Amino acid sequence: GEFYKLKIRTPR
Amino acid sequence: HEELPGLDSQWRQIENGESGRERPLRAGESWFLVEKHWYKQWEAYVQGGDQDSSTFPGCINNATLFQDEINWRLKEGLVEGEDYVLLPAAAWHYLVSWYGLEHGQPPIERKVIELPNIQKVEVYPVELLLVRHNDLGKSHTVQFSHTDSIGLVLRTARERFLVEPQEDTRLWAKNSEGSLDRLYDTHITVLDAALETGQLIIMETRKKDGTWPSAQLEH
């Protein structure tokens, strides 16, 4: 499950 | 191991701009690292006017460039002209013929790469940890050049994980803040994407219902 806890940094 | 040439002959063979140290860097060619103290001792010998001199350098020994003699990984942070001198393949092989290479020790061979405005020996390529999104601990470490494309990284992750041709996959990089950056563009290079040795590269596979796992993540 670790992937689902990671945040995605929205690109600029 | 060949008879040693005279001193002036060795100097010319190893230094000259055609086949020796002064040869220009050309992408794809092999160059070798020589620990600087050894090369300076060889230089003192061949410039010293005495072919019988005790300044003779003995076997090439690059021991101080390696982290250990188990895995022979190059030390980090080495500086050309301080820790090592670069020689093209022809010159390295002549020196090994004449002086020998420390028994059991691997050469340190590296390749020239072409960057936007310069050619450089890539002493430190990039080792990436490739994982599937569903198991971030099951990695395959693969070495890539800084000039390889993100597309090559993705094709390599698909091959190493036995992804089937009809499956859809895309890449993410885990950044130093602990979040994920999407690697949207497969045409740019490892250098353009600022990837680093040891970095986690996550290959996400689209679900069979057509949705992607990353839709579930905080954006």
Residue numbers in the entry:
A (entry chain D): 3 to 14
B (entry chain A): 29 to 247
Copy the relevant paper text.
USP11 harbors a core protease domain as well as noncatalytic regions containing an N-terminal domain present in USPs (DUSP) and internal ubiquitin-like (UBL) domains. USP11 shares this domain architecture with paralogs USP15 and USP4, which are known as the DUSP-UBL (DU) family of USPs. We discovered USP11-specific peptides harboring consensus motifs that do not interact with either paralog USP4 or USP15, and we identified a novel binding site in the USP11 N-terminal ubiquitin-like domain.
Co-crystallization trials of USP11_DU in the presence of the FYLIR peptide yielded monoclinic crystals of space group P21 that diffracted to 1.3 Å resolution after optimization. The DUSP and UBL domains in the peptide complex structure are arranged in tandem, analogous to the structures of the rat USP11 ortholog and homologs USP4 (SGC) and USP15 (21, 22), but unlike the previous structure of human USP11_DU. Unexpectedly, the structure revealed that the peptide occupied an elongated cleft in the USP11 UBL domain, with clear electron density for peptide residues Gly-3–Arg-14 observed in both copies of the asymmetric unit. The peptide's main interacting core comprises nine residues (residues 5–13; FYKLKIRTP), with a buried interaction interface area of ∼750 Å2. Phe-5, which can be described as the first tooth of the bidentate-like interaction, is nearly completely buried by occupying a hydrophobic pocket (referred to as major pocket). The pocket is formed predominantly by side chains of USP11 residues His-161, Trp-200, Leu-208, Ile-230, Glu-232, Pro-241, Ser-242, and Leu-245. The peptide's Ile-10 occupies a second hydrophobic pocket (USP11 Leu-245, Trp-200). The loop between strands S3 and S4 in the UBL domain (S3S4 loop, residues Asn-203–Ser-207) becomes less flexible in the peptide-bound structure due to interactions of USP11 Glu-205 with the peptide's Arg-11.
